[PDB]
Design an enzyme around this catalytic site. Structure first.
Site, PDB file in Angstrom:
ATOM      1  N   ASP A  71     102.069  45.808  90.382  1.00 15.54           N
ATOM      2  CA  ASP A  71     100.912  45.078  90.795  1.00 15.54           C
ATOM      3  C   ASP A  71      99.833  45.934  90.107  1.00 15.54           C
ATOM      4  O   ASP A  71      99.647  47.117  90.436  1.00 15.54           O
ATOM      5  CB  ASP A  71     100.839  45.101  92.311  1.00 15.54           C
TER       6      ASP A  71
ATOM      7  N   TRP B  89      98.385  46.939  99.991  1.00 14.83           N
ATOM      8  CA  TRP B  89      97.501  45.810 100.112  1.00 14.83           C
ATOM      9  C   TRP B  89      98.162  44.847 101.119  1.00 14.83           C
ATOM     10  O   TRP B  89      99.304  44.394 100.900  1.00 14.83           O
ATOM     11  CB  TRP B  89      97.390  45.232  98.707  1.00 14.83           C
TER      12      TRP B  89
ATOM     13  N   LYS C 153      88.723  42.385  88.916  1.00 15.75           N
ATOM     14  CA  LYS C 153      87.873  43.522  89.147  1.00 15.75           C
ATOM     15  C   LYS C 153      87.393  44.128  87.852  1.00 15.75           C
ATOM     16  O   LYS C 153      86.199  44.290  87.672  1.00 15.75           O
ATOM     17  CB  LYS C 153      88.644  44.566  90.022  1.00 15.75           C
TER      18      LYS C 153
END
Ligand SMILES: *Cc1c(COP(=O)(O)O)cnc(C)c1O
Ligand SMILES: *Cc1c(COP(=O)(O)O)cnc(C)c1O
Lengths: 396, 396
Positions: free
Chosen positions: A211, A130, A246
């Site tokens: 993460d 990311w 999300k």
């Protein structure tokens, strides 16, 4: 005095957003999005969270400040989600959770804590990762080194290249792991690879940082956590930055957590007080709404059942689109072997298009993808699948 | 490795919170609070914001991400609140606003922007100031120097000591000004003192930074802004960090703004892109709920009328308690001249008690105040006023 201030670089993905919404063609498909969309092309608010919000509206009596680390029920619910409902980490009270503004806030307060209270100088991030990972750690002054990850040829996890780069990391270096649904590739370690990584990490003295933004999108909530749990069985200390953006469709309410785990119940409290000090000097104490939504869904069984169903429906929708993409490309036909898409997890994967091919996709066909060829599978609907696959077959 | 991590210092005010709520005496009064309370001792959610929240619940269709700088209507509403409804700053488009997580977030992203994009090395903060000011700037690596402010003897603004310390600040040093309701003293510059300060600032090359957390609590929304507006008439560049925590009773939803003003419409955009980059590496994009509440109240006239009334009622309640305190101390009687309390603005003021006197207040009377003698006037109710004034007369 601000006239010599250099404009910040054109945002590596948002540029596509702005470019997209300036096309006069509704055949145009934006697979560059990053957020989930349903079969209608919309990012709905979940039923469970509108129910939770009616409840909060009926029942809140004050907007007085949360404590620095946020709402406590939110904290216990997230370390049960992360670690399992009867984990030794939780029973021995060696984990502390601060509610943060999204998964990015969780990574900046982890970064600030580390930069101010420990001697870490480098964070190892996968190549690719990311892109906002580099930015976050660098703003706290940690240097970011990257380890091999992706095999562009077989479109898989080049595990030997990965362990061989990691042998450059010293003890006390932080190594960042995506918990599941690796962004941008969708390739995740198998459980056996997580275990050898858990084991090599302990040997070499890596501080692991997970993460964990997509719990529930690869396989299920418990299964997606087995990688982190393998490190947590084996490690005295670790940090996991998780996000509810999300899997709860709560993107703009900024709800995430930064969990610190230490050897015992008392060094984690000592370390957590400084993590708390790092939060006080940034945004003071976290936004209550989206975390109150998560805490009331997860602690209410009728609501959690509904949420769970809305999440396996988002997971299934993505798995159907990865499947429909691969054989619709095989009906429209080209020398391909796009089946690797069926092996990847979550919303993203590298399509394997060159930057020139994504450029004539945007330009000649109105199909917008990110220049790295990263595609968001949830931007595919059964209705737009055939124009998409046509455009793609025509540039290969 | 975290076993050599030193516990963070005992929080300069929260310690009192925890200590207070461990007293078996309901005669106990906590004037150490920092948040507004009404005559019942409660921090209600405003009627206007519950109306705004029913509206949002009825009408939101997505929780997709706000842009880095948040909701645009929130931005235009806050620079009209700050600068006045037809300001040249707004017509010439020289101000840009990023929605932030509270006024503290607005100060950390101002601090990070400054530390990364300009050559500021020092921020001048009043002595005294809100204690989390030092922490915020220091975490971005700006050094904090302080300027004289309070005259402990006459309990007023020692203006000559203030301009005389400020002559130590070089050009390009940032000087922090409280817009109104100075925390902790409640003493604010008169308009004439704001103007001479606006004028000396321009001469000396100060970058002014307004911390504007209490708009509407001293005098009214427009009047409370006349100090900032005097600097803004005179300055090409300035920053104001404002908060909606207190005047909307939205504390835990984290709603604030960081407004950057530059010479023109184009250097402010260039500077704002880097402020945006500073936000992306921290929490990515701001919490929507509390800012959506503010934006829908302020842009809907029926709702804004209601809000306005709820805010002049909070302002009036505080002015009545400052008045009831001063003469209830004159009925309970002691060599005093507590009338300076009637000249101070907002919820706080230094009572002028010594640290030993606040200590026997907590210990012998269950009256909790902050060791600096700072008292939150909104913790006074007509019913608890007489036990309070008794305790106070008995320690003087
Ligand atoms: C989306 C994402 C995050 C965090 O997102 P927030 O919107 O800040 O919750 C962190 N890491 C990765 C890999 C992500 O994709
Ligand atoms: C309350 C306050 C702030 C900001 O508070 P937030 O809760 O972060 O909005 C900033 N400055 C002063 C002087 C304050 O009293």
């Amino acid at each position: 005095m601000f006239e010599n201030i250099t404009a910040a670089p054109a945002d590596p993905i948002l540029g596509l957003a702005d470019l997209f919404r300036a096309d006069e063609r509704p055949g145009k498909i934006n697979l560059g999005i990053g957020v989930y969309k349903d079969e209608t092309g919309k990012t709905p608010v979940l039923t469970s969270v509108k129910k939770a919000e009616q409840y909060l509206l009926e029942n809140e009596t004050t907007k007085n400040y949360l404590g620095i680390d946020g709402i406590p029920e939110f904290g216990r619910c997230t370390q049960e989600l992360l670690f399992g409902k009867g984990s030794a980490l939780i029973n021995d009270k060696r984990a502390r959770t601060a509610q943060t503004p999204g998964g990015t806030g969780a990574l900046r307060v982890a970064a600030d804590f580390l930069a101010k209270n420990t001697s870490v100088k480098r964070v190892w991030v996968s190549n690719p990762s990311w892109p906002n990972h580099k930015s976050v750690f660098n703003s706290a002054g940690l240097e970011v080194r990257e380890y091999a990850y992706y095999d562009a040829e077989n479109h898989t996890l080049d595990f030997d290249a990965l362990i061989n780069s990691l042998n450059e990391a010293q003890a006390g270096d932080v190594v960042l792991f995506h918990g599941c649904c690796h962004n941008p590739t969708g390739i995740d370690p198998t459980l056996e690879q997580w275990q050898t990584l858990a084991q090599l990490s302990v040997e070499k003295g890596w501080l692991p940082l997970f993460d964990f933004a997509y719990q529930g999108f690869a396989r299920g909530l418990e299964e997606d956590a087995e990688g982190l749990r393998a490190f947590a069985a084996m490690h005295k200390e670790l940090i996991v930055a998780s996000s509810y953006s999300k899997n709860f469709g709560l993107y703009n309410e900024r709800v995430g957590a930064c969990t610190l785990v230490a050897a015992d119940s008392e060094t984690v409290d000592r370390a957590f007080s400084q993590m708390k000090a790092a939060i006080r000097a940034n945004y003071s104490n976290p936004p209550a709404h989206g975390a109150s939504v998560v805490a009331t869904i997860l602690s209410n069984d009728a609501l959690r059942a509904i949420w769970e169903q809305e999440l396996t429906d988002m997971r299934q929708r993505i798995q159907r689109m990865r499947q429909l993409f691969v054989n619709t490309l095989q009906e429209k036909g080209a020398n391909r072997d796009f089946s690797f898409i069926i092996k990847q997890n979550g919303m993203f994967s590298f399509s394997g298009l060159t930057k020139e091919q994504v450029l004539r996709l945007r330009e000649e066909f109105g199909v917008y993808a990110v220049a790295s060829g990263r595609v968001n599978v949830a931007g595919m609907t059964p209705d737009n699948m055939a124009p998409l696959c046509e455009a793609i077959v025509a540039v290969l």
